[PDB]
Amino acid sequence: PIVQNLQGQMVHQCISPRTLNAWVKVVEEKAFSPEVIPMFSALSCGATPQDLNTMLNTVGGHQAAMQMLKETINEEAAEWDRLHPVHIAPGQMREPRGSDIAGTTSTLQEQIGWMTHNPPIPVGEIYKRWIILGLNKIVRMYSPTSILDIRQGPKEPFRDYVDRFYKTLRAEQTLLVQNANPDCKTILKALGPGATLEEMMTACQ
Amino acid sequence: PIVQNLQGQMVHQCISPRTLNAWVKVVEEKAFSPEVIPMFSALSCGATPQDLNTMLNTVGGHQAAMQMLKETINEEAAEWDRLHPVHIAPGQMREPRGSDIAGTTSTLQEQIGWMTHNPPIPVGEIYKRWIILGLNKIVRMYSPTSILDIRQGPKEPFRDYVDRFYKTLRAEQTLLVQNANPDCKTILKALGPGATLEEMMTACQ
Amino acid sequence: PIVQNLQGQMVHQCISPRTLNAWVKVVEEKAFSPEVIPMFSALSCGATPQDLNTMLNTVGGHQAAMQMLKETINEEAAEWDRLHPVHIAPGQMREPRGSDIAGTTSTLQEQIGWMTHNPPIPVGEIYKRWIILGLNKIVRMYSPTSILDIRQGPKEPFRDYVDRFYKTLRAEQTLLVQNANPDCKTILKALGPGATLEEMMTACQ
Amino acid sequence: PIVQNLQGQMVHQCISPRTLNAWVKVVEEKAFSPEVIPMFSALSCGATPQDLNTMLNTVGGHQAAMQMLKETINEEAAEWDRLHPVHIAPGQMREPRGSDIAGTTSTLQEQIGWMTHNPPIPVGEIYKRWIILGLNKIVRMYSPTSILDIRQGPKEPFRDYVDRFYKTLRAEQTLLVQNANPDCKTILKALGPGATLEEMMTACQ
Amino acid sequence: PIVQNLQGQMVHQCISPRTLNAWVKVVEEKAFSPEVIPMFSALSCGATPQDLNTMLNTVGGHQAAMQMLKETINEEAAEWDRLHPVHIAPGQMREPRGSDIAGTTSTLQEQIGWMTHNPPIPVGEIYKRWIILGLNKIVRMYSPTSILDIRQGPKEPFRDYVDRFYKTLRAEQTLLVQNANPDCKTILKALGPGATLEEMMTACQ
Amino acid sequence: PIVQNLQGQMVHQCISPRTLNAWVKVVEEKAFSPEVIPMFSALSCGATPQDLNTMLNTVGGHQAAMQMLKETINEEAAEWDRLHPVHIAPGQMREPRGSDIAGTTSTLQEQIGWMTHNPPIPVGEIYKRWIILGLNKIVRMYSPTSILDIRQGPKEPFRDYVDRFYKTLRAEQTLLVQNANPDCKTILKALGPGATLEEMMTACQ
Ligand SMILES: O=P(O)(O)O[C@H]1[C@H](OP(=O)(O)O)[C@@H](OP(=O)(O)O)[C@H](OP(=O)(O)O)[C@@H](OP(=O)(O)O)[C@H]1OP(=O)(O)O
CATH class of the missing domain: 1.10.375.10 (Human Immunodeficiency Virus Type 1 Capsid Protein)
Known part of the structure; x- marks a missing residue:
């Protein structure tokens, strides 16, 4: 150098x-x-x-x-x-x-x-x-x-799903909600629009 | 740098x-x-x-x-x-x-x-x-x-309990006495108010 | 710094x-x-x-x-x-x-x-x-x-006992002779007073 | 130095x-x-x-x-x-x-x-x-x-084959297509001439 | 420093x-x-x-x-x-x-x-x-x-014996010949006096 | 220093x-x-x-x-x-x-x-x-x-033999051909005189 x-x-x-x-x-x-x-x-x-x-x-x-x-x-x-x-x-x-x-x-x-x-x-x-x-x-x-194949499992903690999701997006260089499991998806739909990631992760904890 | x-x-x-x-x-x-x-x-x-x-x-x-x-x-x-x-x-x-x-x-x-x-x-x-x-x-x-779920076990040494308690408070950024087990709680109640942590740990040793 | x-x-x-x-x-x-x-x-x-x-x-x-x-x-x-x-x-x-x-x-x-x-x-x-x-x-x-509970075992080499004894004194910040086993204690009593530690360890080897 | x-x-x-x-x-x-x-x-x-x-x-x-x-x-x-x-x-x-x-x-x-x-x-x-x-x-x-003995196996991923192929060429200081397995060879033949390595690896993925 | x-x-x-x-x-x-x-x-x-x-x-x-x-x-x-x-x-x-x-x-x-x-x-x-x-x-x-208890074993290579002998002398801060096994001792006696260590080790190899 | x-x-x-x-x-x-x-x-x-x-x-x-x-x-x-x-x-x-x-x-x-x-x-x-x-x-x-006891085994690759041979010569500070196995020895005899080591190793590969 x-x-x-x-x-x-x-x-x-x-x-x-x-x-x-x-x-x-x-x-x-x-x-x-x-x-x-x-x-x-x-x-x-x-x-x-x-x-x-x-x-x-x-x-x-x-x-x-x-x-x-x-x-x-x-x-x-x-x-x-x-x-x-x-x-x-x-x-x-x-x-x-x-x-x-x-x-x-x-x-x-x-x-x-x-x-x-x-x-x-x-x-x-x-x-x-x-x-x-x-x-x-x-x-x-x-x-x-x-990214289309990163979907939250029925027993997968939301945090672990989000980690896989953003790890994949990073390598590939509302989808997050769409690919969530039924239970979180309900919670997330009810938060209303323009929720931060912190708020979604808190809600689904 | x-x-x-x-x-x-x-x-x-x-x-x-x-x-x-x-x-x-x-x-x-x-x-x-x-x-x-x-x-x-x-x-x-x-x-x-x-x-x-x-x-x-x-x-x-x-x-x-x-x-x-x-x-x-x-x-x-x-x-x-x-x-x-x-x-x-x-x-x-x-x-x-x-x-x-x-x-x-x-x-x-x-x-x-x-x-x-x-x-x-x-x-x-x-x-x-x-x-x-x-x-x-x-x-x-x-x-x-x-912090509300950090309680001293019936066989847990007081020092080990205090370590878990302050480790949790740190991450969350009289409760100590309230969450102690029956035996220490008695000892601690009898020390009277404004005891230092050193004094409580000595008493419960 | x-x-x-x-x-x-x-x-x-x-x-x-x-x-x-x-x-x-x-x-x-x-x-x-x-x-x-x-x-x-x-x-x-x-x-x-x-x-x-x-x-x-x-x-x-x-x-x-x-x-x-x-x-x-x-x-x-x-x-x-x-x-x-x-x-x-x-x-x-x-x-x-x-x-x-x-x-x-x-x-x-x-x-x-x-x-x-x-x-x-x-x-x-x-x-x-x-x-x-x-x-x-x-x-x-x-x-x-x-330090009161550091006593030489009947089969414990004197050197190993002295190591435990001074390790404890250090942490706590004639007792050495008093807490020796019967065999060393005899040897040590016979050395007479103001023996160095080197002399006691040599005698009990 | x-x-x-x-x-x-x-x-x-x-x-x-x-x-x-x-x-x-x-x-x-x-x-x-x-x-x-x-x-x-x-x-x-x-x-x-x-x-x-x-x-x-x-x-x-x-x-x-x-x-x-x-x-x-x-x-x-x-x-x-x-x-x-x-x-x-x-x-x-x-x-x-x-x-x-x-x-x-x-x-x-x-x-x-x-x-x-x-x-x-x-x-x-x-x-x-x-x-x-x-x-x-x-x-x-x-x-x-x-290099003549580096041939893609019937179940070998194309990427793994290319890695072996270029590792060998490096040590020895269209062959790639000729030594591919039947399935990739077909895909590669159809790409037409002057395909980049990126394009061949994409096609055979 | x-x-x-x-x-x-x-x-x-x-x-x-x-x-x-x-x-x-x-x-x-x-x-x-x-x-x-x-x-x-x-x-x-x-x-x-x-x-x-x-x-x-x-x-x-x-x-x-x-x-x-x-x-x-x-x-x-x-x-x-x-x-x-x-x-x-x-x-x-x-x-x-x-x-x-x-x-x-x-x-x-x-x-x-x-x-x-x-x-x-x-x-x-x-x-x-x-x-x-x-x-x-x-x-x-x-x-x-x-050093008096360092003696060459009947099957011990002379080099290994000399290593133990000088390791002990170092810690304690003709004996070498006297403490050799019968076979080496014979060889060494026959070398005559003022042999170097190199010569003794060569002879007993 | x-x-x-x-x-x-x-x-x-x-x-x-x-x-x-x-x-x-x-x-x-x-x-x-x-x-x-x-x-x-x-x-x-x-x-x-x-x-x-x-x-x-x-x-x-x-x-x-x-x-x-x-x-x-x-x-x-x-x-x-x-x-x-x-x-x-x-x-x-x-x-x-x-x-x-x-x-x-x-x-x-x-x-x-x-x-x-x-x-x-x-x-x-x-x-x-x-x-x-x-x-x-x-x-x-x-x-x-x-070096006299370094001889090529009947199944030993020539390269492995040469490695042992030069490792020994180094520590001791035509013999190579003489100590080769029958198969290499034949090949080496036929190369003629003043062959380099590279040529002998190539021939016996
Ligand atoms: O390799 P050593 O001889 O043991 O000495 C090194 C070494 O620095 P030098 O290149 O000056 O020797 C380091 O360099 P690297 O090998 O990691 O490149 C360095 O580590 P840093 O790169 O983090 O400086 C380091 O210092 P440190 O104590 O911070 O590890 C230090 O060892 P000492 O300074 O303790 O001798």
Whole structure:
């Protein structure tokens, strides 16, 4: 990553073993549950394209997902190249292409040079947006169940039903009342319209 | 978070993997037991709105609770907007709206700019107050038992009863004597009024 | 806590996740065994009143003990207010009351201001003394056995007996010879007076 | 490794116990699965030849692999010596030979001297390229199965098949359709040409 | 402890939770095996008397041992007071007594003042010598077996016997040949005098 | 150890609990497998003689080995004294003897003084060479099997045989073909001379 030292210049620091290990574990434990994406974003704070490639490449399973992600990255890179065509002056900074942003045709020195320029060309932030676009599609694809099949069981506590319902909506990126069991549905119908979630959960407790 | 370096300027630092992992674990282990709230407050010391959103978004379960929290945050944001209406001068700091404080319509650069201004606009401290308001309502809602149902068993040591009693009061946010078993109740009645808790526990040992 | 940086000014630092987790675990594992108190004192080195409240508030069980501690803290605060009455000049440091020292009516900024003043008002050290007074009473109360009931068994090695004896004395805050078994008691009587513990343990080995 | 301190000079730092332990574990757990190579590259960021030799030498098993790697390193060193022949001036920097780059005939002081020269001779980056060449050959050799033997089972979900297929291709460094089961193959044939992987996985879900 | 910062002044630093936890564990796992003493010495590098008392006081068991240690410390303190009698000038450093060195009648500020004086009065190093004197007596006392009872079994490999023999000598602070079994004893007698341990172990392999 | 701070002077730092614990564990887990030696060398980077003695003394078992090591160290120290005889000028640096290099008759202050002198007397590097000489003899002695007894089993995969073969050669510090089973031996004989290990392993797969 690129960090500010104790004296206030932006410098390159090695990715820590703690960071590397945290990412690999979360993917092992959680696969592409939606909460993996904000964890990815937090663990890659200040990342260079080189560091982002490290994090993706260190994943050993889920290789269908990692191929789908490469495809998304190649589409965003090709759209970058459409919007930002490029033409080198000795000693001067060249303009990045899509494949430079994705870290496949650029060196770590060029990446640092772009990211610490005045004004900077935030190649790490741009690449991370492409990656997250790709990861969101994977989360959606790996979602096991439609929101239409989340219905409250006859003996299921309302809180447990709402937890399943919002967990599914999150992964898929009045239905709550419609899919409630007969007993809660009655209670909820009687609350009247524009009830908060707190009020519905209180009523059905 | 925003920290002071070794040379005494306020600078942005990445959220640590240690911090991220501590929060996720405590929610996995403790759910919305009341002691989770002072842990949240301690783990988010110096946080930007971006960092607070990271911590909330990295929770994978309890999605009914996290929806209730979004609702509370939207109410506080709307009250902010009532009290502090806003109208940009090139290069100058804009005034934050509710959604800027909650980190949904502001960038990390704007958040740092507000929090390190002279004088600062403590957007992270303001947002954290809204979050804690929301978390306290959740703790109260998830409290399993009324204080009225905490009564000392015929064979239950007085200390164990008092522990259950104050654990429940804490989550719900002379009753102690009234709910004691016959044997302790006698002892306690005879101590006379304005006995300390130490004196009651000593007497019933 | 308040620490000296690498350049020698006293500055505020966030409580670490390592510190927070160490305290919670030691209370989970050891409850109010006497050795918990020197651990508390070591983990709270340089603490502000805010940090001390964090550490106490993050404990989830033992809520009878934490209520007894609040009582002790309120007594010490009221005695502070007796000895040090208070009357604000724009921009000037106000004098702390008992409730300021205990961190309930003071901000973190005021606490840092007191603790780093020339000369300082060590509000964190004062509060920590009150807490430790309260914790010692709890250790004493939770002591399972009287020293009078620690007697050496007919087959118990003398070393194991002495370990139980001094473990109990520590928690309760010639008896050793009197409570020894017949065989050691004989040996010990014959050593004559003013024998060291090393000499008694050697003799009874 | 060679790192920049807080004041911006390139200095030598000891390899951390965290780094050493991370590498040894990943080799214990993953052997020569392909994802071990990007982990090696990330854990050896800024490494001297001495540090790279440490990491290789601390591996206790897989000694057939570590002998094959020595062979590859000796070939690259001999090609270095072909391209860059060498001839010492008192106090002056000598030119490195292949065996200097691999750290067997150079001291740590010479290695730092080369790597921090203006302009630098990046002996650590050169050696790491040789090592990675050698590691890729080992990954290929230890690949258990040909891509030709990865075929979708009659009851195997398409996603699980694609995961095995791309895991194998990765280690070996229209076949996907040809090796699909009869049911998916039909669906896939009907999609028409130039379907993305996302579209094939959606269709076969 | 007292450490040098990044800028080269000697300053006080809080004892780390890592240090505190390492000590407590090693005593839990190893009791007073001899290797506990060099671990104590390494974990207390730069310690103040306050820090040394922390480390001793955080031990929960072995209270017979910790009482024996207090006795040894009181003897060394009384001998200090014999050799170095003391008589305060406003603002000036007082001379330490035995009980000041052991940290019972001195403040942390006085301890830092002594240890960082020019020239320094190394109260932490002096106290640590007293503690180690006391710990060595405990190791000796807790030694389970006399060296006279370490004899090689008829089926015991010579290496395993030598390991037990030197483990015992270490704790107790030609016998090796005399206590060998008949078969090795013959081999060893025939080697002739002034054989190294390597030669004896080779011969008996 | 002696490290460079953030400002570029060589200063003494305490051995870390992480370092201490890593060494003790690796000896517990691996005994004197050959890979323990490069781990020792990496964990003792920048060590003073005091730090090296700490690491050796913290090992609790293998006391026959640690006695053999003391013997080797005493031989190297006596050869040092032969090559470098010594004769003190008030305030001046004395010349080190063998026992000074091994840290038994020198203080930590003298050791730092030598190691940071201009030019330095690298007492830590010299002692570490003696230790490693001693450790290599121990690895050799504890090697369980002769290379002559490593032969490929009739059902043993060639890769597994080569792993055992090079693991043994490493500890002992055309035989490969001679000790192969009949089936591989045939294949290998037919490859012709000067085949690489990669080619032999490919052929026998
Ligand atoms: O790995 P160790 O040598 O035991 O030391 C570590 C380590 O910090 P260093 O990288 O400076 O060694 C940690 O880093 P990670 O391995 O987790 O990346 C860190 O944990 P944090 O990341 O949360 O800082 C930590 O400190 P903590 O005590 O807060 O766990 C600390 O251990 P000690 O400071 O106790 O020695």
